Amino acid sequence: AQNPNCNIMIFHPTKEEFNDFDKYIAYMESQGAHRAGLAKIIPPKEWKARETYDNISEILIATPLQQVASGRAGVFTQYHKKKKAMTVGEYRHLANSKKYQTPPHQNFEDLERKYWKNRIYNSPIYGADISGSLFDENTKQWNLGHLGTIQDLLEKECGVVIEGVNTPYLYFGMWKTTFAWHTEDMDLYSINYLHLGEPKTWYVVPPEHGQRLERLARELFPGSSRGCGAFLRHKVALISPTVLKENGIPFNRITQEAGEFMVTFPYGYHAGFNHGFNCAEAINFATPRWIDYGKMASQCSCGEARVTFSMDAFVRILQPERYDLWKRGQ
Template identity: 60%
Template sequence: MEMAEEVMTFTPSKEEFKDFVRYVAFMESQGAHIAGIAKIIPPKGWKPRHTYDDIDDLLIPAPIQQVVTGQSGLFTQYNIQKKPMTVVEFQKTSNLAKFCSPRYVDFDELERKFWKNLTFNPPLYGADVSGTLFDPDVSEWNMAHLNTILDTVESESAVKIKGLTTPCLYFGMWKSAFPWHTEDMNLYSICYLHYGEPKSWYVVPPEHGRRLERLAKGFFPGNAQSCEAFLRHKMTLISPSILKKYGIPYEKVTQEAGQFIVTFPFAYHAGFNHGFNCAESTNFATQRWIDYGKQAKLCSCRQDMVKISMDAFVRKFQPDRYKLWKAGKDDTPIDHVKPTPEATMEKKSWCRRKNRPYAVIRKKTSNM
């Protein structure tokens, strides 16, 4: 089996942490995007919020119960909307005997319990709650204003898209999960775990994304026939043992409270929560994303699926390709290894600061 790239962990200094766009470019200059996901541990002392003691009464308007059917590593998740509840009510529910986290020695044991018990005791998930827990005066990595080129959507069309151009909160409990998907329009995503139990992620590197799509299509032919982009429905759970059996490279990473996770364009990811927690997430973009956005396969069967016009992005950032693209003739293949154009300058700058030689990223190739 071909190995996936190792997931990188970054520990920026206070100075490096000040500029989000620049640091993402630096991460790509180091090859972080090749794995499809990266972990970032903020500088010591950095806090996004003074206190979390004041959010108990925050309302979760539409918690969902996640009912899972299936067997042998192949599952479908159905979301049943429940009545509104406050954060403190959700937390109390998560502590009930049938919902609380099991005892476990290490991650491997917890992971086995997750996949073994997926179809029992459907958990609740407080997903897609509009809002942010970042204090307004926090300037670093504040999800309410990351200041990336995705802001072009708002400036050009005066449209805000919940969870995509604005942040959303996610309240998890043991076994609540997010099925295999890429982000809307194959964008980047950023997730911060404010507090609580860890969140574990699986990721398939972007260069192997089409292989995962073919595998899912083979296992769920009815879904694939109904919608070419059925994985965008976020209903499909495929266990790592199945991925391994069919030679799909993947990696896992566990996010602890106080850590960021960034997913890169066209990185299929899935995961689950270890227990009660609160995370915040939104999308962003770099110039490298534009080709992914142009080639994104969109769901054709649901009215509420997100679609962004790429016109403003191509016109502004790829003017030399605009006419070709408008004529439907811009079929430039995507290079999943090449970092975003902003990264070249940032890597040279970083090398100068650290007094290190500049090197070009090469793709690792190894076999198991």
């Protein structure tokens, strides 16, 4: 068995290996990459996403989200308070202001310690989930706006056409902005490209151990767990690496830098934070191996988790017994 300890693997494809996206995902899995839940891909030196980032300041962040924490330093939830619209140029200036800028630090480990010590005492503002793309249309390799669609994958594997579209999203971050513990909708894959700026640190639980994280979360967030049997799908709960280690939860960590891709695999729980002003682009995708995960994925039906129009058909076709109850939740 490849990668039996479930370590995060790092890949360096050549320019020729970077041509066929599906083929390279399958290659990574043949080496055991999916057992970690997350892999890093460093593009060949000949590749570029676009020519420059000098002309992005007029993009609008229509609803910046202030991430307000409750709890204790290592076990907390966050809620999102909507703020007035601002451009990317205005957001970058805000991220770099004395109130929000990254503190002095010696290395990524020092900054990680500062994050877990001090995150709850501040409320950073995240420009998350903006529909759009920063890839140049002439970039033909690993262009997140030109991947095969999940709807076409389901049709190819199972035989019928479904409605729906999926397109990429942009995330403009600042110091301490946080993504909570979650798997993707319907336990899909995701791919994330860090276009510009300061790093993004990731934590991940191997898919084979995801239930261990779920059990700990129910113990640590007892009211939330009573309200919804899949409450991690609300994307609001944080648990620190120290607390995970105290409870014996298997996990790994890695820092992503500008110019690097991260792929999350089906049922790979992940969480993390931004080091400073940055911009990432992300999209969900599927492969033939995803189908059995989609068939078994848990659902939030309590009302909290977001309406995503494309998920309707995935539940309808893969989980017909659950569809009626799930639909009432939407």
